[PDB]
């Protein structure tokens, strides 16, 4: 009947990104104590990662019916409006309703910042992550996100600090490696972008293999950008093809593929991809300006 030992192992499959397992570890604990304060924050995250929009919908809104005192309940419903939305304005409103009900409730500070971090409000997301890193010490996530937010803002030297701190905790985290190559890429260091993206893929692929592709696809899109940038056009195309199998209605991947062709000199075939990308995203600032180069040249045979 002693179950706090579970919430350690289930917490380990969440940091090492083995979600399928962690979830069946928590539903065990959860089958006992649903209002488990230290386990709930975990089983809530795993639904989100797995895309249990269904479970999380029922759960999140229940906790609020019969437990409007525990901050976990607005962390829940907030995490709900974050994975789906786009009631973004709501999320921040619920998650702040948990901080101002127990400011020492770290989990709501990480979800809070994630709400600024998606709307681009870097100053304010940042501040939230630095409050979470105080409330959730030893946890590497808050540090993975301040590092990234630094990278986005040209703090490549402070970005490198928190990436390596987060790596010396959960070194086997594919989302850690990911945002590191992601930042390298922005620095113009395409070469070392290729190596971090590949590494995050072998660990996502063969290792923690289970088709974590849910709520996900990027990685492959990203790799395709690297190889184009590395003039590896031939290897580039390949990665976008697979990003489409994963998300067969993505317009950005169609613009990325048509742009490679135009770098390759295949205009007839490129403009073909530049059409079937405005068919999806009409406001394609880049597909549109490029399509203009392609025709000025058609007027000239």
């Amino acid at each position: 009947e002693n179950l706090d030992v579970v919430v350690s192992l289930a917490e380990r499959h969440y940091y090492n990104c083995d979600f399928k397992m962690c979830y069946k570890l928590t539903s065990v604990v959860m089958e006992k104590d649903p209002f488990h304060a230290s386990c709930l924050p975990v089983h809530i995250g795993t639904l989100v990662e797995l895309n249990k929009a269904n479970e999380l919908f029922y759960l999140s809104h229940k906790l609020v019916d019969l437990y409007p005192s525990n901050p976990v309940s607005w962390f829940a419903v907030g995490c709900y409006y974050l994975m789906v939305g786009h009631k973004n304005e709501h999320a921040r409103r619920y998650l702040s309703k948990a901080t101002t009900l127990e400011k020492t409730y770290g989990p709501a500070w990480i979800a809070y910042g994630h709400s600024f971090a998606v709307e681009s409000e870097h100053d304010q997301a940042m501040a939230a992550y630095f409050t979470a890193a105080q409330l959730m010490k030893g946890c590497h996530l808050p540090m993975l996100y301040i590092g990234l937010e630094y990278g986005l803002t040209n703090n490549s030297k402070l970005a490198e600090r928190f990436f390596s701190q987060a790596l010396s905790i959960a070194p086997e985290d594919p989302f850690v490696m990911h945002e590191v190559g992601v930042v390298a890429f922005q620095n113009g260091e395409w070469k070392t972008a290729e190596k971090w993206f590949l590494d995050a893929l072998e660990k996502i692929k063969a290792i923690g293999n289970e088709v974590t592709v849910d709520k996900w696809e990027p990685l492959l899109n990203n790799l395709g950008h690297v190889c184009r940038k590395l003039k590896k056009y031939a290897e580039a195309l390949d990665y976008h093809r697979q990003a489409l199998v994963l998300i067969p209605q993505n317009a950005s991947t169609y613009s990325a593929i048509g742009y490679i062709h135009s770098l390759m000199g295949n205009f007839e075939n490129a403009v073909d991809y530049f059409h079937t990308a405005l068919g999806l995203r009409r406001d394609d600032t880049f597909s549109v300006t490029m399509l203009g180069h392609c025709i000025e040249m058609y007027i000239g045979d």
């Binding site: 809530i44 990027p218 770098l263």
Partner: peptide, 26 residues
């Protein structure tokens, strides 16, 4: 414990340089 979708790369306009350098050269 909560994560935000792996940052996805998107095309900037500055990226059109690659195509610029392709003919300017060739």
């Amino acid at each position: 414990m909560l994560r935000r979708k792996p940052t996805r790369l998107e095309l900037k306009l500055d990226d059109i340089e690659e195509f610029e350098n392709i003919r300017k050269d060739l």
